[PDB]
């Protein structure tokens, strides 16, 4: 399935080249510009655990998730991954725990040492 495919076929987008965040572009977005640090970014997402459980989805809440890019308001994988996206793009991210919640995990759904899968759509970005 999609988690396996991005695990085996994704591109390493980390600056360290440590395979901690792999990405596949599923839907090409618009033009060439990516957001800049500090921009308000609006995303839709779906997250799955390695046991197959869906642990979150913005679609189901009927509102996008909004954060300021590059400020550590989200897991590292999201700061790194969204920074690579164009407006309108959909990608898959496969995130090792060092770029997510590490040994701590995150109650209720995310265990310790969890590799996470996400589908992310970048709806918009603005300064």
């Amino acid at each position: 399935g999609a988690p396996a495919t991005v695990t085996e076929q994704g591109e390493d987008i980390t600056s360290k080249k440590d395979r901690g965040v792999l990405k596949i572009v599923k839907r090409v977005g618009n033009g060439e510009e990516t957001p800049m640090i500090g921009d308000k970014v609006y995303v839709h997402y779906k997250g799955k655990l390695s046991n197959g459980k869906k642990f979150d989805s913005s679609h189901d809440r009927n509102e996008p998730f909004v954060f300021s890019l590059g400020k550590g308001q989200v897991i590292k994988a999201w700061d790194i991954g969204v920074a690579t996206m164009k407006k309108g793009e959909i990608c898959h991210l496969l995130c090792k725990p060092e770029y997510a919640y590490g040994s701590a995990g995150s109650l209720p759904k995310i265990p310790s040492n969890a590799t996470l899968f996400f589908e992310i759509e970048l709806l918009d970005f603005k300064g």
């Binding site: 997402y45 997250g47 642990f55 979150d56 308001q73 989200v74 897991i75 995150s106 109650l107 759904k109």
Partner: peptide, 5 residues
């Protein structure tokens, strides 16, 4: 909580 931290 997710999707924060």
């Amino acid at each position: 909580s997710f999707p924060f931290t």
